[PDB]
Amino acid sequence: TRPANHRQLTFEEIAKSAKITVNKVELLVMKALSVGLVRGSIDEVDKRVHMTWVQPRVLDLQQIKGMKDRLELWCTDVKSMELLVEHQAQDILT
Amino acid sequence: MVLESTMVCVDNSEYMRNGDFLPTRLQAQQDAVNIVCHSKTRSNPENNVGLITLANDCEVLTTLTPDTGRILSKLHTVQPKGKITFCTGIRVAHLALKHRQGKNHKMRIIAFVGSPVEDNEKDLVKLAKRLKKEKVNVDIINFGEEEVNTEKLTAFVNTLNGKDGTGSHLVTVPPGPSLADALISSPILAGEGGA
Amino acid sequence: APAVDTAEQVYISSLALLKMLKHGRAGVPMEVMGLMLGEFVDDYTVRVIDVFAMPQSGTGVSVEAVDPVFQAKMLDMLKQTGRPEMVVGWYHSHPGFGCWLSGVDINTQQSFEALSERAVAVVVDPIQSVKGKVVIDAFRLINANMMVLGHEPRQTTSNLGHLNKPSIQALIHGLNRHYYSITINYRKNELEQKMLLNLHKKSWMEGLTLQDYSEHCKHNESVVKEMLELAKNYNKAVEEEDKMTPEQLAIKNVGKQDPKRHLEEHVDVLMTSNIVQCLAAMLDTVVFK
Amino acid sequence: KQYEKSENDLKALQSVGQIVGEVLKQLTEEKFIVKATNGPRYVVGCRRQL
Amino acid sequence: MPELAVQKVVVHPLVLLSVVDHFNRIGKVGNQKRVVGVLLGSWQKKVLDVSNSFAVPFDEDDKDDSVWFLDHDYLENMYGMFKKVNARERIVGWYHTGPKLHKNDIAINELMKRYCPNSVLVIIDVKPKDLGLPTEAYISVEEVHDDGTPTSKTFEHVTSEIGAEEAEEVGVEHLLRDIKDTTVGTLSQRITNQVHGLKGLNSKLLDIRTYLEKVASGKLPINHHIIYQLQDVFNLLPDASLQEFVKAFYLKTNDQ
Amino acid sequence: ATVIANSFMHCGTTSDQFLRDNLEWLARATNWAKFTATASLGVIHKGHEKEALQLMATYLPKDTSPGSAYQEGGGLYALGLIHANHGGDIIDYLLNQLKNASNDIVRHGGSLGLGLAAMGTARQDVYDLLKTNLYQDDAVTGEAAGLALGLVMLGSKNTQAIEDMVGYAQETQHEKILRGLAVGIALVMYGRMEEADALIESLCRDKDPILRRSGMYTVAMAYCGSGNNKAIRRLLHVAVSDVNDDVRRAAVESLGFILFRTPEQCPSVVSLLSESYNPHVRYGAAMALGVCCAGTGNKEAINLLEPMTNDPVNYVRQGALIASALIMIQQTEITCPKVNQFRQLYSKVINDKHDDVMAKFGAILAQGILDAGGHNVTISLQSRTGHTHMPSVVGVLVFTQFWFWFPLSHFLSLAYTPTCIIGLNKDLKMPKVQYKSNCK
Amino acid sequence: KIKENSEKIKVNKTLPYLVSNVIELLDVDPNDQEEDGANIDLDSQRKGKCAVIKTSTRQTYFLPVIGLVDAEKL
Amino acid sequence: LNAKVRLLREELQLLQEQGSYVGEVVRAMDKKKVLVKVHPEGKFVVDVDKN
Amino acid sequence: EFLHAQEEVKRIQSIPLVIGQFLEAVDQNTAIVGSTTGSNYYVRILSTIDRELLKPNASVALHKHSNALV
Amino acid sequence: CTKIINADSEDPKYIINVKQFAKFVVDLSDQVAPTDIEEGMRVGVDRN
């Protein structure tokens, strides 16, 4: 749901969604990592599971739409930025 | 026939399953085509023969060449259960007539009907009119329509005659047992030469 | 009353030149040949659209190898493709000497001259070409008949004029017995230049692609170590440089060529990689996020 | 069959025939100084296809 | 019939030059229609080297793309002949000349395999589809796609590279003095390349966006490869920081 | 090269001598070299109006004397060259022949001769005829006609000529015809400055190389007589970037033309080009210097010319040799040592056979232009009306072209005006009266 | 295709050409461990079987033998 | 920079010219040629150079 | 153009090459060497690369196509 | 010719050895016969 700013979620936040205890959630997440369904790291000092990698999600319409949000945003940041790269020493490209 | 190039259209259908022509209508139609193709070359070596299909997505399988063997090889192999899209077969045959190794020949298509035609009568009437202008003549051999009921072909033929390199005509063979090959008797080997 | 029958300056397109360079290069040390197909328009321009090789020779560019049969066979096919073109001339490679025809080759050349007067003979040297316009000349056959007519000056007229160079023995001998030399100039369109350039997708992408941070630090430290060496020579050079010419001063008060230059090149390469990667890194992080 | 057997000469001539050696000294993996069987010594390359 | 030996392909500049030239010339066919000719290169090897191309008789009609002209025999004749000019030029397959990849192309792909050893379908366009090469390489694939849709026959793309042999390199290098992607000669040369990668990236973003909508409305087949590829960019997480470099130069400039 | 040189050298006098000795020369001759010789007679016998029709008479088409195509066409050119710079009667004669035959190599001469006689009428009749000659797509009559047309419409900026010649240039990919239309287009564009800019951009813009190569001529005439900054910038910019050899060479020749009025600015600009080892750029550089300095000779221009002369590549030598002669134009041995040395230098190229064929061509032409008028004619930098002299520019622009067809250099005769005290009174008579002269 | 091959070998077969003697054969495998150009073949850019000859200059060549008459036939 | 470009380009053509050996002029002959004794190869009589 | 030109020389610096021994320098331009091919050569030393650490005694390579000391 | 044995699919070839220490084969530009080329017989042959 979250953009490419954070793929980090806390244990607390995972527990709320799951509606399963914080303790058992920590073991469950570890078994999923172990199998290889998901990848990432667990920092239990912070208590976040930082997802490096996430798998192909469920095919519903909404899920097609989630992809659009990032692609559209990316179109505008690239335009802005492309102009800054052209700007620097425009006198010499030759 | 003299200074002429002809492409033969083979009708792959689902009404070629009948043994009214032996062995199978289609196999009898291969044979009918092959003797006509040979007759044309033998009579006048100035003849070229090419092969096009209605079957599948429509493409020119082999082109016009003095060699009857080039066309024959492909004819047997083309899918017996093909499409009876007539109009698309005619159009591609027009494109091949343009591209030959020596260009001085008239443009002709001789067409086989293994079956009653699927696509509207309206469409064929039109195609015939535009095609007539480019000066490609389609001569239609009729056994195929007749199996269920009287020939639609005669109307398309009539529209076609008026401007052609050589005349168009309906050659009729009974759809039952008299064999496909009987077409050698009716003239398609040499048209009417008409205007 | 007189006719034309001059050798016009041959316009070689970008694809045809590449096909000649490739034909020769595989083809040598063996003497090889093939035909040139094009269109000739006007009385100044012959454009060489395409070439292909009509079966390659053995020992010599033999008179056996020139074949009207193969030439005829290939020509009728072209008609069916809807590209009918005519034989504009023919090309051959010699590795023997740059811009030279063999003895056998002049006889072979005569069959092409009879077919069309505008038949040309191109000598390709793959051994001695490392610019690929170099050591290629267009030539024309000198028979007993041609020399008596005075066809040889007649060729220079209608273009910029061109004489060969490679080797002394090959230029004197070639000029008398073998040929007269005439010009090749090149026209290649802007589309041809665009395809020539090889636009490539990863080629531009690398510019953005971020290199390791540790690798820049490591490099920064390595680069400094080259400057240190140069720095001893550089301290001595700088003490007196009170006259003119920095290079003389620098050599004189120890330090081969320019110690300053060496130092500067060393920072520039490191600065270049670090500077672009920093520009790229800040940009990507913000864009993707 | 007849085609492939004659054609083998056709390709070999374009590959160009081979002058043979034995490897004299391994200095680096890009250049090797190689010694001809005939005699005169040469520098050869190694390609990454072997 | 089908087989894979395509893998990755490298293209000499000669292929690119040959297809446009023959394409217009072939009978003044419009430069947005489907035209196919034989594609030459070395073959029955794992890495594919596309050397050259040559035309095969083709006419493309307006009324449908299910009506076209092609001479199959011509493919066979050409194969033998190309061997004399170079040993590296044999029947590799066929070339398509844009603009997209059509259903109508699939009928010819089938056919080509018999004629050629197994063929490749390379699409060489007259204008890039991105900003780099105008070539795409394809192999026919059958894959199950689910959203209410059955198993689809499609063409799955494999990435392309550039590359040439020594003869080709010699002429292009002497002739070139153009601006290029980058030549390299200054720091400033390098920025031109940086501008070109970023502009390229903009182009790809537009194609995917318009398609995402089409998938949602139509229930177009969902290819696993696309959904997975886009997903990955998002998950990796950007992080970037500390950067520095030297400043030795001043004493040197001052020194001059 | 000898025919051009002599055409210029023996000008301003009648010469029955020339026809009588150089009959064997005419017989010996082949190709374009033969055409130049029959054509050249007009320049040698320039003026001498009574005799004009009579001397040429055999060469000129007859029912009682039909020669070679080469002779018939050169005959027609010869009347046009004598009466050059307009003459009402001369046109009518050329016009009947042009429209009737509509042939090849004979027609080519007719168009050139006809162009001169018509020069500065803007006639529609002439437009119709020359159009017919172009339209066939016959190679020789096409280049001649395209150029011929531009002479007639010149300096009024007639719209129609520009339209006809441009539309044709684009459809047709014939390079020979192409060069002749472009030049035609330039002759019309003269002295309109900034206006010309719309057409000039269109010609550089195209993916075609041929338009671009001939494109430089338009810029050259129009911006001459007050040169624009944008216009010089383009000429330099196209040259560096190109891989197309002819296009490159050409760009460099025009630089001298726009600066013709301020000759001072050109040797610096050319210096950068002189230094490179590119022979195509070297060729153009020589020409640039040659035209700018042509009225007002600079020492600096001469020095740049020296390495191009002895260079390996064939064409650069030619350029240098023709160019020096043109700057220094008809100064005596008492004005400078340089003219005397240069006359000998050309001879030298001829004595030795170590040198290119092409250097030899330039050497004999060079001697002749310098020596032109019989040591009486000069080319102007500008008129002293503070804009450029029209005969000087039209002639020089065309002169560059001699390879496509060699009789096109004869057109040079238009630049040549002698410098004297001029002081006619009312009745079409110069007087015999003496003039005060306060010079050595 | 056959007539074209057949004429080219013949141009090769006509003199000049060296004569030597075959001391030994080896006949090593086709396609050693490489891929380059053309196709896998007895000889090409890929060559298997060869025969070593000692020529009359006291020079040695190991060369691939044409398949018209093989190295195994040699 | 022009000069540097030129040096390499000239260097490339000048050099391509095959061969270049050493000999010794043992003697000179009345044919205004000199006998060269090439040290591990055949002896060759050549014309004088202009150098 | 300088970057394009350097490319061209690199190719020559590389194989084909034939080895010799480099005896001594008679000019910075050109030097005398001896081959294993049975020919003593006067070969040119490639410019815009050092010819001044060329000069001591060492093994050296000469190009086969150009007959120079690259 | 050191020895006569060759006549391999052309009018008699034999091994003739030039004094550059290389062996070559002969063809007709006059004739060739068992008697024209012999065990000791020297021959005149072309360079190319």
From Swiss-Prot, chain A:
The chain holds residues 283 to 376 of 376 of the full protein. The modification N6-acetyllysine is found at K16. Belongs to the proteasome subunit S11 family. This is 26S proteasome non-ATPase regulatory subunit 13. Signal peptide: none annotated. Component of the 19S proteasome regulatory particle complex. The 26S proteasome consists of a 20S core particle (CP) and two 19S regulatory subunits (RP). The regulatory particle is made of a lid composed of 9 subunits including PSMD13, a base containing 6 ATPases and few additional components. It comes from Rattus norvegicus. Component of the 26S proteasome, a multiprotein complex involved in the ATP-dependent degradation of ubiquitinated proteins. This complex plays a key role in the maintenance of protein homeostasis by removing misfolded or damaged proteins, which could impair cellular functions, and by removing proteins whose functions are no longer required. Therefore, the proteasome participates in numerous cellular processes, including cell cycle progression, apoptosis, or DNA damage repair.
Swiss-Prot record, chain F:
One of its GO terms (cellular component) is proteasome accessory complex. Disulfide bonds: none annotated. PC repeats lie at residues 36-69, 74-107, 109-143, 144-178, 180-213, 214-249, 250-282, 284-318, 319-359, 362-394. One of its GO terms (biological process) is proteasome-mediated ubiquitin-dependent protein catabolic process. It comes from the Eukaryota. Keywords: Acetylation, Phosphoprotein, Proteasome, Repeat. The keyword Phosphoprotein applies. One of its GO terms (molecular function) is enzyme regulator activity. The modification N6-acetyllysine is found at K353. Component of the 19S proteasome regulatory particle complex. The 26S proteasome consists of a 20S core particle (CP) and two 19S regulatory subunits (RP). The regulatory particle is made of a lid composed of 9 subunits, a base containing 6 ATPases and few additional components including PSMD1. Interacts with ADRM1. Interacts with ZFAND1. Component of the 26S proteasome, a multiprotein complex involved in the ATP-dependent degradation of ubiquitinated proteins. This complex plays a key role in the maintenance of protein homeostasis by removing misfolded or damaged proteins, which could impair cellular functions, and by removing proteins whose functions are no longer required. Therefore, the proteasome participates in numerous cellular processes, including cell cycle progression, apoptosis, or DNA damage repair. Belongs to the proteasome subunit S1 family. This is 26S proteasome non-ATPase regulatory subunit 1. The chain holds residues 368 to 807 of 953 of the full protein.
Swiss-Prot record, chain I:
It is found in: Cytoplasm; Nucleus. It comes from the Eukaryota. Component of the 19S proteasome regulatory particle complex. The 26S proteasome consists of a 20S core particle (CP) and two 19S regulatory subunits (RP). The regulatory particle is made of a lid composed of 9 subunits, a base containing 6 ATPases including PSMC4 and few additional components. Interacts with NR1I3. Interacts with PAAF1. Interacts with TRIM5. Interacts with ZFAND1. Belongs to the AAA ATPase family. Component of the 26S proteasome, a multiprotein complex involved in the ATP-dependent degradation of ubiquitinated proteins. This complex plays a key role in the maintenance of protein homeostasis by removing misfolded or damaged proteins, which could impair cellular functions, and by removing proteins whose functions are no longer required. Therefore, the proteasome participates in numerous cellular processes, including cell cycle progression, apoptosis, or DNA damage repair. This is 26S proteasome regulatory subunit 6B. It comes from Rattus norvegicus. The lineage of its organism: Eukaryota, Metazoa, Chordata, Craniata, Vertebrata. The chain holds residues 71 to 140 of 418 of the full protein.
Swiss-Prot record, chain J:
Signal peptide: none annotated. It is found in: Cytoplasm. The modification N6-acetyllysine is found at K19. Monoubiquitinated by RNF181. Coiled coil: none annotated. Component of the 26S proteasome, a multiprotein complex involved in the ATP-dependent degradation of ubiquitinated proteins. This complex plays a key role in the maintenance of protein homeostasis by removing misfolded or damaged proteins, which could impair cellular functions, and by removing proteins whose functions are no longer required. Therefore, the proteasome participates in numerous cellular processes, including cell cycle progression, apoptosis, or DNA damage repair. Belongs to the AAA ATPase family. Component of the 19S proteasome regulatory particle complex. The 26S proteasome consists of a 20S core particle (CP) and two 19S regulatory subunits (RP). The regulatory particle is made of a lid composed of 9 subunits, a base containing 6 ATPases including PSMC2 and few additional components. Interacts with NDC80 and SQSTM1. Interacts with PAAF1. Interacts with TRIM5. This is 26S proteasome regulatory subunit 7. It comes from Rattus norvegicus.
